[PDB]
Amino acid sequence: GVLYVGSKTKEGVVHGVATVAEKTKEQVTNVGGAVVTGVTAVAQKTVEGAGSIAAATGFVK
Amino acid sequence: GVLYVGSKTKEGVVHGVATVAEKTKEQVTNVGGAVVTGVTAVAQKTVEGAGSIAAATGFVK
Amino acid sequence: GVLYVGSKTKEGVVHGVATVAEKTKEQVTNVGGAVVTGVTAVAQKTVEGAGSIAAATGFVK
Amino acid sequence: GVLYVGSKTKEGVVHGVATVAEKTKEQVTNVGGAVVTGVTAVAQKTVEGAGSIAAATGFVK
Amino acid sequence: GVLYVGSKTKEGVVHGVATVAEKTKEQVTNVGGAVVTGVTAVAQKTVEGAGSIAAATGFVK
Amino acid sequence: GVLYVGSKTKEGVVHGVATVAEKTKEQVTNVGGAVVTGVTAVAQKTVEGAGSIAAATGFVK
Numbered sequence A, B, C, D, E, F: 001g002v003l004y005v006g007s008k009t010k011e012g013v014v015h016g017v018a019t020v021a022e023k024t025k026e027q028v029t030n031v032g033g034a035v036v037t038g039v040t041a042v043a044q045k046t047v048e049g050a051g052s053i054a055a056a057t058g059f060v061k
Helices: none
Strands: A001-005 A014-016 A020-023 A027-031 A040-044 B003-006 B013-015 B018-022 B026-032 B040-044 C001-005 C013-015 C018-022 C026-033 C040-044 D002-007 D013-015 D018-022 D027-031 D042-043 E001-008 E013-016 E017-022 E026-032 E038-045 F002-007 F012-013 F018-022 F026-032 F042-043
Touching: A001 A040, A020 A027, A027 B018, A040 B003, B003 B040, B026 C018, B040 C001, C001 C040, C018 C026, D002 D042, D002 E026, D018 D027, D027 E017, D042 E001, E001 E038, E017 E026, E026 F018, E038 F002, F002 F042, F018 F026
Parallel strands: A001 B003, A014 B013, A020 B018, A027 B026, A040 B040, B003 C001, B013 C013, B018 C018, B026 C026, B040 C040, D002 E001, D013 E013, D018 E017, D027 E026, D042 E038, E001 F002, E013 F012, E017 F018, E026 F026, E038 F042
Antiparallel strands: none
């Protein structure tokens, strides 16, 4: 197919994934997998076939 | 296929993944996998076939 | 296929992965895998075949 | 006295005196005297005492 | 007295005196006297005492 | 007195006196006297006492 993205912007501000924690005991932060951030962000066919992206957190204690 | 991305921007500011923790005891930070950040960020076919990207955190204690 | 990325920007500022911790006891920071950051960031076919990128943190204690 | 001018501007465009004539026979253009133009234009005490500024056009024919 | 001019600008464009004529017969252009042009233009005490600035055009024919 | 001019600019463009004529017969251009042009243009006490600046055009024919 044909995918066309045309952006004509001015003074653009983008914030992605932000995590804030305070006055805790145990902190676990697992971020990623397919994180895409930006003024012109394009994600296509991130998974094809039998692939896998598993951003998991196996907390046990 | 055909993928066309056209960006004509001015004064662009992009923030990616930001983690802030304070006054904790145990800190675990696992970030990555397929992190893409920027004014013109393009991600295509990040997974093909039987591949895998597993950004996991196996906290046990 | 054909992938075309055209960026015409001015005064662009990009921040990637930022981690801040304070007043903790145990600090673990595992960042990477496929981190791509920049004004014009392009990631394509980061995984092909049976490959793998596992940015994991096996905290045990 | 005290004269304070404080300007904090961004992307400022100023046009002064513009004259356009077309398909005429006799053209007379007398411009000046105390012309002040600009983003931060200040004019003070342009005339003091018995002075004079006479931007005149004595067309006779 | 005290004259304070404070300008904090960005991307400033200033045009002064512009004259355009076309398809005429007689063209007379007298410009000046006290022309001041610019992003930060300040004119003070341009005339003191018995002085004079006469930007005149004595067309007779 | 005290005259303070403070300019903090970026990417400044200034145009002064521009004259354009086309398809005419007689062209007379007299420009000057006290022409001041520029990003930071300051003119002070251009006339003191019994002085004079006469940018005149005595066209007769």
